[PDB]
Amino acid sequence: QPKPILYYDERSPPVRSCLMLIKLLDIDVELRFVNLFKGEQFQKDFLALNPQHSVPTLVHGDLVLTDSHAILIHLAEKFDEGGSLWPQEHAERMKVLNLLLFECSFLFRRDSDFMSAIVRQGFANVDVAHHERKLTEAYIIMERYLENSDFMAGPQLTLADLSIVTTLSTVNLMFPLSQFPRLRRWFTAMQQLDAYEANCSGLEKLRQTMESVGSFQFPSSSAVVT
Amino acid sequence: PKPILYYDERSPPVRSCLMLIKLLDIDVELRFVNLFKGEQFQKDFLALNPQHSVPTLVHGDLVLTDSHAILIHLAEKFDEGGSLWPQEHAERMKVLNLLLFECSFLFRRDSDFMSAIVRQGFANVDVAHHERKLTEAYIIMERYLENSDFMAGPQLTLADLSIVTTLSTVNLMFPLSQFPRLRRWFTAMQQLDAYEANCSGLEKLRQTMESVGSFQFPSS
Numbered sequence: 001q002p003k004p005i006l007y008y009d010e011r012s013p014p015v016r017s018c019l020m021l022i023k024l025l026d027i028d029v030e031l032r033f034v035n036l037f038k039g040e041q042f043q044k045d046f047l048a049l050n051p052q053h054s055v056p057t058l059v060h061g062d063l064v065l066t067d068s069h070a071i072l073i074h075l076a077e078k079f080d081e082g083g084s085l086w087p088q089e090h091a092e093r094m095k096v097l098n099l100l101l102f103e104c105s106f107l108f109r110r111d112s113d114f115m116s117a118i119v120r121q122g123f124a125n126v127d128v129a130h131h132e133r134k135l136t137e138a139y140i141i142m143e144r145y146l147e148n149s150d151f152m153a154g155p156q157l158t159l160a161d162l163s164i165v166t167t168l169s170t171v172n173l174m175f176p177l178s179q180f181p182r183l184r185r186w187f188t189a190m191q192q193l194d195a196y197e198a199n200c201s202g203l204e205k206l207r208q209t210m211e212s213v214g215s216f217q218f219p220s221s222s223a224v225v226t
Numbered sequence: 227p228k229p230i231l232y233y234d235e236r237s238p239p240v241r242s243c244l245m246l247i248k249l250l251d252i253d254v255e256l257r258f259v260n261l262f263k264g265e266q267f268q269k270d271f272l273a274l275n276p277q278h279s280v281p282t283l284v285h286g287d288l289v290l291t292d293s294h295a296i297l298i299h300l301a302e303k304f305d306e307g308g309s310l311w312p313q314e315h316a317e318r319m320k321v322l323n324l325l326l327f328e329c330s331f332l333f334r335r336d337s338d339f340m341s342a343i344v345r346q347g348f349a350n351v352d353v354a355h356h357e358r359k360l361t362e363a364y365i366i367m368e369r370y371l372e373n374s375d376f377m378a379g380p381q382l383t384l385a386d387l388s389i390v391t392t393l394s395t396v397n398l399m400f401p402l403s404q405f406p407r408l409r410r411w412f413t414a415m416q417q418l419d420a421y422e423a424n425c426s427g428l429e430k431l432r433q434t435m436e437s438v439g440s441f442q443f444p445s446s
Contacts, residue, residue, distance in 0.1 A: 051366045052331055063316050067326035074319050091288050094299050101292035104330050106277055141276045 004029045004075070007046070007057040009036045010202025011209060013108065013166035014068030015056045019202070020162045021072055024195035025079045037209055069100045072159045085159050096153045099145070099160035103167060106141070110134045111171050115210065123216035135171050139180050142168070146182035150189070157193075165190045169203055169223075173210075176222040184224060191226045229254045229285040229300070232271070234261045235427025236434060238391035239293030239333065240281045244427070245387045246297055249420040250304045262434055294325045297384045310384050321378045324370070324385035331366070333392050335359045339399070340435065348441035360396050364405050367393070371407035375414075382418070390415045394428050398435070398443045 006022070006029050008015045022029050034040045034055050041053040050057045050066045058065040058074070065071045076086035087093045114131035142164070145152055153160040168187060177184045190196055211217055231247070231254045233240045247254055259265045259280050266278040275282045275291045283290045283299070290296050301311035312318045339356040367389070370377055378385040393412060402409040415421055436442055 051369050052327065063319055065319060065323050067323055067330060070319055070323045070326055073322065074315075077315060090299075090302060094288060094290060094295055097298065098290050098292055098295045101295055101329065102277065104326065105292060105334075109330075109334060144276055 002061055004058055004060040005032060006030070006071075007032045007034050007050075007055050007059075009034055009055050011206035012036065012055055012202070013111070013170045014163070016166035016199045016202050017068050017163045018056045018058070018071050018075070019198040020166065020195045021075055021085075021159070023198045024085075024162070024193070025075065027075060027079050037213070067104075069104055069159075069163060072100070072163060076159060084156055085162075087158065092154060096158045096160045099153045099158075100163050102141070103160070103163045107138045107164065107171070108167050110138055111167055114174075115170075118210060118214040118216075123214040132175060135175055138171070139175070139177070139183060143180045143183050146186050150186065152186070161186075161190060162195075165196070166199055166203075169199055170206065173203070173207055173218045173223055176219075177224055187224050188226055191224075227286055229283055230257060231255070231296075232257050232259050232275075232280050232282040232284075234259055234280050236431040237261065237280050237427070238336070238395045239388070241391040241424045241427050242293055242388045243281045243283075243296050243300070244423040245391065245420045246300055246310070246384070248423045249310075249387075249418075250300065252300060252304050262438070292329075294329055294384075294388060297325070297388060301384060309381055310387075312379075312383065317379060321383045321385045324378045324383075325388050327366070328385070328388040328392060332363045332389065332396070335363055336392055336396050340395075343435060343439040343441075348439040357400060360400055363396070364400070364402070364408060367411075368405045368408050371411055376411070386415060387420075390421070391424050391428075394424060395431065398428075398432055398445055401445070 004027070006018060008019070008031055010016060010019065034046060036055065040046065041055065047053060049059070049064060052066050054066060056068050056071055058071045060074065063074070065074055073086055076083065080086065082088065087096060110131070114135065117126045117131065142152070149155050151157055151161050152164050165187065172187070177187065207218060229252070231243060233244070233256055235241060235244065259271060261280065265271065266280065272278055274284070274289060277291050279291060281293050281296055283296045285299070288299070290299060298311055301308065305311065307313060312321060339351070339360060342351045342356065367377070374380055376382055376386050377389055390412070397412070402412060432443060432446065436446065
């Protein structure tokens with residue numbers, strides 16, 4: 001019943017997906033900033049709330065959620081009851097769930113491995129070709145999904161698109177989409193949604209933070225901008 | 227049409243699905259895909275699942291490529307109204323939150339360790355690094371068990387089935403002796419009839435890892 005509280009750092013793509021859903025559904029939510037690059041997620045009180053030391057973390061009454069994909073489903077079920085973002089029909093809902101788990105286990109995992117290598121080693125010491133292969137593989141899979149539909153999980157916008165677009169925009173700071181016409185079309189369409197504005201500041205903050213910590217510049221030509 | 231499960235029982239996410247199939251008496255058709263021979267890269271399997279992973283379930287026209295989606299789908303279709311995937315929203319969110327901890331944290335870190343063994347050889351893995359990453363997962367689970375007998379509340383749910391198989395896999399290398407709640411919970415899980423579905427693939431994974439990584443686990 002009390003309004004949700006979101007612990008967040010907008011540089012995180014999963015955080016941005018929750019910010020996008022909050023904007024799309026017009027949800028009133030208290031924001032509490034946790035600076036991941038300063039290690040504020042290791043403060044004792046935050047660790048007591050979420051021992052995984054991660055954002056987004058949502059506190060909604062007694063419920064404490066520590067994964068973006070649970071937060072997206074929870075907020076859709078509470079603030080979009082009966083809607084199409086988290087579909088009513090079982091098969092369509094399982095397709096969206098399957099895509100959310102692809103984002104967690106495959107796209108995000110590989111982008112996190114790459115970006116954490118940059119922070120830990122410096123960009124000049126990362127095997128960028130290795131990560132390019134891993135992440136281009138994810139682009140190929142997404143292009144294949146979109147060869148069948150204009151959205152990731154079917155013919156309409158779902159939570160899968162909100163979860164995937166933020167991490168895709170993050171991978172695309174580095175790796176261009178010139179060779180992926182369906183992924184370009186979809187990303188352009190997602191950027192026309194008013195809710196996409198919630199992605200913009202955090203993407204830019206992540207770009208700047210990574211350039212500083214990793215001592216490099218992303219190639220400006222890569223990012224798709226409309 | 228009955229569900230088809232593409233599987234290699236060495237995979238802990240596969241074992242979680244085998245455990246649920248045994249608990250719910252689901253009639254499935256099993257099709258083996260050998261992960262250590264690279265059969266997940268065969269062209270027909272890749273056409274089905276471009277993430278080249280098991281478990282993969284084909285149920286009618288529905289193709290699921292992640293164990294946590296498979297667990298939820300099978301519970302919804304074959305255990306409607308049961309307690310493994312709770313009806314009440316807050317309880318269900320708690321289960322979902324733990325399934326995603328398993329995917330994003332426990333499994334990710336065990337995968338990173340076990341992959342390192344296969345790629346580099348055990349003698350060349352930074353075991354102390356992986357011990358810190360995996361012990362941190364043990365610490366988190368010990369905290370999750372502070373208030374309840376099971377991972378997501380007072381009774382067995384899908385979260386326990388997902389977590390127990392990967393935990394048993396981490397436990398090939400790293401003992402539970404420092405984590406009393408977690409050790410008690412693991413012993414209780416081993417007493418379930420359905421836990422028998424974990425045993426064969428866990429031992430096969432032990433043997434395959436010891437051969438490929440040229441070592442013996444401490445627990446061996």
